[PDB]
Design a protein around this motif. Structure first.
Motif, short mmCIF file in Angstrom:
data_model
loop_
_atom_site.label_atom_id
_atom_site.label_comp_id
_atom_site.label_asym_id
_atom_site.label_seq_id
_atom_site.Cartn_x
_atom_site.Cartn_y
_atom_site.Cartn_z
N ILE A 213 0.81 -1.23 0.00
CA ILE A 213 0.00 0.00 0.00
C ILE A 213 0.84 1.29 0.00
N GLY A 214 2.17 1.19 -0.11
CA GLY A 214 3.06 2.36 -0.06
C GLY A 214 3.12 3.03 1.33
N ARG A 215 3.18 2.24 2.40
CA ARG A 215 3.26 2.70 3.80
C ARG A 215 4.67 2.48 4.37
N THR A 216 5.26 3.53 4.93
CA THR A 216 6.64 3.56 5.46
C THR A 216 6.74 3.74 6.97
N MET A 224 10.08 9.33 -0.34
CA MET A 224 10.85 10.00 -1.39
C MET A 224 11.56 8.99 -2.29
N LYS A 225 12.29 8.03 -1.71
CA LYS A 225 13.00 7.00 -2.48
C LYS A 225 12.04 6.20 -3.35
N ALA A 226 10.94 5.72 -2.77
CA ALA A 226 9.93 4.95 -3.49
C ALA A 226 9.28 5.77 -4.62
N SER A 227 9.05 7.07 -4.40
CA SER A 227 8.34 7.94 -5.35
C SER A 227 9.18 8.38 -6.55
N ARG A 228 10.48 8.08 -6.60
CA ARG A 228 11.34 8.45 -7.75
C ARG A 228 11.16 7.55 -8.97
N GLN A 229 10.50 6.41 -8.81
CA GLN A 229 10.27 5.41 -9.84
C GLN A 229 8.81 4.96 -9.84
N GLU A 230 8.41 4.23 -10.88
CA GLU A 230 7.08 3.63 -10.95
C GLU A 230 6.85 2.70 -9.75
N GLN A 231 5.68 2.80 -9.13
CA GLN A 231 5.25 1.95 -8.02
C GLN A 231 4.06 1.11 -8.45
N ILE A 232 4.12 -0.19 -8.15
CA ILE A 232 3.01 -1.12 -8.33
C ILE A 232 2.54 -1.55 -6.95
N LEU A 233 1.30 -1.19 -6.61
CA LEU A 233 0.67 -1.46 -5.32
C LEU A 233 -0.43 -2.50 -5.50
N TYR A 234 -0.57 -3.40 -4.53
CA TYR A 234 -1.62 -4.43 -4.50
C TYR A 234 -2.45 -4.24 -3.23
N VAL A 235 -3.51 -3.44 -3.33
CA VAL A 235 -4.32 -3.07 -2.18
C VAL A 235 -5.40 -4.14 -1.97
N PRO A 236 -5.38 -4.92 -0.87
CA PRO A 236 -6.42 -5.91 -0.61
C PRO A 236 -7.75 -5.22 -0.32
N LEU A 237 -8.83 -5.71 -0.93
CA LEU A 237 -10.19 -5.26 -0.64
C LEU A 237 -10.85 -6.26 0.32
N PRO A 238 -11.02 -5.92 1.61
CA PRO A 238 -11.35 -6.87 2.67
C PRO A 238 -12.85 -7.22 2.75
N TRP A 239 -13.47 -7.55 1.61
CA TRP A 239 -14.87 -7.97 1.56
C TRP A 239 -15.11 -9.25 2.37
N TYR A 240 -16.36 -9.51 2.76
CA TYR A 240 -16.70 -10.70 3.57
C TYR A 240 -16.16 -12.01 2.95
N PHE A 241 -16.24 -12.14 1.62
CA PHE A 241 -15.85 -13.34 0.89
C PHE A 241 -14.33 -13.53 0.77
N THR A 242 -13.52 -12.52 1.09
CA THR A 242 -12.05 -12.64 1.09
C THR A 242 -11.50 -13.12 2.43
#
Lengths: 481, 481, 481, 50, 49
Positions: A213-216, A224-242
């Motif tokens: 989620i881009g949390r430091t 700053m270091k992370a934001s100098r390049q492309e970031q790919i984030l995988y944010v879990p969606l915590p629905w009942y079925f997950t």
């Protein structure tokens, strides 16, 4: 002789524990299961994805059940250029560290405690006078012992160069709201602030969502270091079925309903912080000003493929699933005494609440739920049902630390408060307590906040209250409701 | 074709796992439960709460079961003043950092290894000679390779101002002993040292008691910051009935017995550390010398309210609860070879042991179980039953790290050792092994300690041994025993 | 009135959850178990233990079941001496920090991007030119925004004295391969690289193996401190029977088979790193050059003693245990596109994969799975069954972070990737999904690696792929197979 | 109920929307257009006058 | 991504790109990329994802 004597040294009390033992420790027993396979499939949005817009996706039917769901977000790398060097300097305004609105708001509360010629003082003398006035303010308001001035002068070693970065936990902040829809009906709704609170309380040690989620943990140099390049984030969606395999959403049982994810995106101006006010923020690869069309997202879904016999059984009789739905009460705060009227419905398992200062929001620190000077914004809270105390007045630490210790996998690092009616509110399949708010005429959360909370520069601070409630999702004749 | 072929590719071995499958992953099943509610209620002590005194509370009957129990402690903020500036300088003595008894004790062991004119040397030269003598001592005793002198000269950056602070994990240290009593009989007893050991071994990642007990992981600057203002601590009391909802203490089944918590409080002199020996410690708000009557505590109890049918069933037949009781063997240590005769009773699940140097205790570092120079105080241990080795001689790391890895939720950060007879000693409802000490004529824990342990300045170092044992609590006709 | 009304406010939906409730929260129920005891016994190897050799132990029959198994390793303390001062300077070569092959390999990739007179430049000017060339390389290859040169100049504060240390996680590195054998048949095989990957993914928060395997999380100063004295390591061997008490290996049921652990040891030259190339590494106590015979190891086994009735029942009918076996595909990498043909057998639960640069291996950093400049070595991966995409192309972060989040107790701190066919691959007793690789004609893992991976100085980088598969161990007439 | 276009909306382009099924009948239909405010500057004062 | 809302039994399709600069230069049938290179690196065709 001793170990055999221990096995013989049994009485009438041991009979309740060991007579007719149905289990042994010295032989494994296992259960056979039906055949299944898991497949992860990435899918594009049906509408354009942009900052500040709403986008939706119709979820494909590529298996028999739907299990995990991740929002795959791609953020460009950031660069900065001086506005004077830019052929088109006109961009949206971003929060800047040379204009720290949160620090200015904190200084505003201690201005009445500054002794001497503050206006004419040198910068180093102003910093000393502010640190002394902080001691006088804290002594007057909290009976605090004074801290040595040198211990309050924390220089965050900020780098002596120009930068911009994506805000802390940007993967959650981007998702202002998401709605899981089936057949055009909203089944559940999640909010950025709720996603963060859920990760704080239910996030397991060694499985925190930090990189995903881009949390430091508020380390600006890592953002700053992370934001100098492309970031790919995988944010879990915590629905009942997950939450559990037995709650996986039965696609085959809902054949005549479209399944949709709707996402309301954060505005671009709220997503970026820069070193200086006069900088233009550029897309690092394209060398153009960053714009609302530079947000990219897709949905990564885990499908379950079933054996024909289990698929046919599930199609014939999917029955009912116990679900957890989320409800929200969002309120502006302009006084140290706040009463929230919780118009939630159904059997509520638990609720979360927390406050955000206007100054923290305006500084782009969206998940900073601290009070003035980083203190706890809540002094005490009380919970009332029909004007009767269900929980009498308790201090902030009881709602934050004792409730988390009793009912949650983790204690929050931020000022998130909770209260559970359930013995195990993190168990998705076993009901363990609730209060039915649809049978209460009034539910009131009364808060006493810190002094000067919601005054002056913090006018329109935010109170968030989120509740988790039980409902039932029914599957019948290829429909879900 | 492949996924369907996998479901068909079954043989006689798969029949033991999957034939007549009683579970599916693609449909949730849930159980219905009875109606209940939880209420947290804070209650004052029946007697005065003071440092060094014993206080008791009779627990109110505000619900049908008793679940969680927290000791709510309120400690005043601390300030310091020079004794010369104080109208009444006469106060109890506190440990002081200008008189580091632990560092002086460590220096005393290396004095025989100091080469040259130590008595006449400059301060910086004395520090060099002590670091060189530490290398010579460690080479002679442990065949250790010498560390560079600069790596041994760790300046703890102590602040250049006057302060006092509450000792590390003060919430546990305050509770020298607590007794849970029913009908005048002691059902269980817990100790400060046991509470700390239990949190080290059983404290889950992300749910450590740090803030709730005033624990900083030995960061003196954080203890100083916390001690400048009023602290509210919520110390969990880990009784058998707080471990699982099915073990909640049935108040309705014990109607004719008073339920009491008795607490023996720590002496005030042991609770505070100061920067300098000549400082008076003041209550930060009241500006008076700190005194034994400045301790405030109350009991926060979680009650369970049951539906009438379940309440009536429990009143008619509460039956028996499996309980875990704690036992203690406390011994003074004056030699490197120590034999502890463990006169414990009942089916023992496990035991914990650890040592405290006299110098660490006198320095106010009550949970520092390290040896000389911060080393492991145990070299090896052996466990004997009736003079026969039940566990042959094993090194300290086996008792500390291997036993914790096998049986506990966490590895201890301090020199706490354990041994389990149970496969799952943290399971409160499922017996998984024990040794019946009431059927052993002798149980001996033989320890080989580090060289010079319990000699000279460490004469009367402490050995703690705590055991967890099974017993049965019976409820009959409104009585409990 | 409200709490009683909630118990009465039930409908037809509540009947599925609470009608005929078989559980209460207000009364504990416990099960009785059979009598058993645990004993830990240390046993010497049957053959000599030496670096670079193979050693075996025949496991003694000191109880009825075998539960936990630890390799107890004793490593001597290290000292260093100049080769000029040594009477016999001839020793095996060790990796040295004055000859950082990994840093030299990283510099080799940026040499084409160095502008100006690199060969004739001062040392400080060469460091500047390398940092600028790194920005130009990363801009050209990754469209990365340039980092400030001062932020790339991380001086690791290396001590200004001579040292040698055991490599990071030396307890795992020492075990190049271990084989669990029964009756001369290999039942399972584990590798150093697999042990590390398993601890990264399955290592629980607060129970990480750090001290037990000599792991510091890449803090060289802590490895140096630890390496100055004798180290005792307890390396867990994660066999199927160590995972759950019901899987404990039934010694009584296998009476006619010898149980053996075989261990292939790492070469001494790979186990040590030194400050300088011209140093001789000495045994700290013996003051002799370190040699292959200075490795000491023993096997610590936990035996279970059963009551006669359970022992007799297990001897008469031990039946079958579900087991997990490990399989390995090891490949050299010389190109950025790599296809691994996974010739694994049986129902595969999951697989792990990761890459090691030749330069990281040669530098003695055996568990550094990072790419060039510490980047992620994988750009994307695809999984094919019979040339059909089972998992379409996904980025490295999906295989590393999303798969770990879904199926594992922890996210890896290193570039370890996983994929699970099982919903719960860490459950040792409940099958929760698999793919039968013995029924697939081809299984291919296609990798796109970072640019220049396996080129030049990294020619013969390593790809590791490990799979976990189900099999059945059968016990009959005192034999196991 | 307000609904976004399925394609990008731009001057001189063609855009389409697939109308959602959020009820049983469709009655009124309005195109909600948002136009920015306008300002003017002399071409001589503009960094990109084209 | 081009969403091909075509109807009926499709035999085949053609696609190509034109740079704005080629169009503005009056070179209307110059479907080349930058410096006369191939404007497409790769393409994929999806039916129902």
């Amino acid at each position: 002789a001793g170990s055999l004597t221990q096995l013989l040294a049994t009485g009438s009390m041991d009979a309740a524990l060991t007579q007719n033992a149905t289990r042994t420790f010295w032989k494994s027993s296992y259960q056979k299961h039906s055949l299944f396979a898991l497949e992860s499939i990435n899918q594009p949005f049906t509408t354009q994805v942009q900052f500040g817009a709403e986008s939706h996706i119709t979820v494909n039917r590529q298996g028999d059940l739907l299990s995990w769901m991740y929002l795959k977000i791609v953020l460009p790398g950031l660069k900065v250029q001086n506005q004077a060097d830019t052929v088109q300097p006109t961009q949206q305004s971003f929060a800047s560290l040379d204009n720290d609105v949160a620090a200015q708001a904190d200084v505003s509360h201690v201005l009445p405690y500054i002794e001497g010629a503050y206006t004419e003082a040198s910068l180093n003398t102003k910093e000393q006078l502010i640190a002394e006035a902080k001691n006088s303010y804290e002594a007057a308001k909290y009976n605090a012992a004074p801290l040595p001035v040198a211990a309050q002068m924390q220089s965050t070693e900020m780098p002596d160069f120009d930068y911009a970065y994506w805000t802390e936990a940007i993967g959650f902040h981007l998702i202002k709201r998401a709605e899981f829809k089936v057949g055009g009906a909203t089944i559940d709704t999640i909010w950025s602030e709720l996603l963060f609170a859920m990760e704080e309380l239910m996030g397991r040690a060694g499985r925190r969502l930090t990189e995903t989620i881009g949390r430091t943990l508020r380390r600006p140099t890592e953002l700053m270091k992370a934001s100098r390049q492309e970031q790919i984030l995988y944010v879990p969606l915590p629905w009942y079925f997950t939450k559990h395999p037995s709650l996986a959403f039965p696609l085959v049982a809902a054949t005549y309903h479209n399944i949709q994810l709707w996402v309301q995106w954060a505005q671009l101006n709220s997503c970026i912080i820069k070193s200086r006010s006069n900088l233009v923020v550029l897309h690092a690869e394209r060398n153009v000003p960053i714009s609302d069309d530079h947000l990219r997202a897709s949905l990564e879904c885990t499908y379950v493929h079933l054996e024909a016999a289990e698929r046919d059984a599930l199609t014939a009789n999917a029955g009912t699933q116990l679900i957890v739905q989320h409800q929200a009460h969002l309120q502006q705060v302009s006084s140290n005494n706040v009463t929230a009227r919780l118009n939630f419905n159904f059997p509520v398992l638990e609720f979360y609440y927390f406050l955000r200062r206007k100054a923290n929001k305006d500084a782009g620190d969206h998940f900073n739920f601290s009070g003035i000077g980083g203190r706890d914004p809540v002094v005490s809270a009380e919970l009332l049902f029909n004007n009767t105390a269900r929980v009498t007045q308790k201090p902030a630490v009881w709602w934050r630390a004792v409730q988390a210790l009793q009912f949650h996998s983790s204690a929050p690092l931020t000022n998130i408060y909770s209260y559970s009616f359930s013995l195990s509110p993190e168990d998705p399949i076993t009901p363990s307590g609730s209060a039915n708010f649809s049978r209460l005429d009034s539910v009131e959360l009364a808060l006493t906040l810190q002094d000067d909370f919601g005054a002056a520069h913090d006018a329109n601070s935010e109170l968030f209250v989120f509740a988790r409630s039980y409902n039932i999702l029914k599957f019948t004749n290829g429909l879900a409701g």
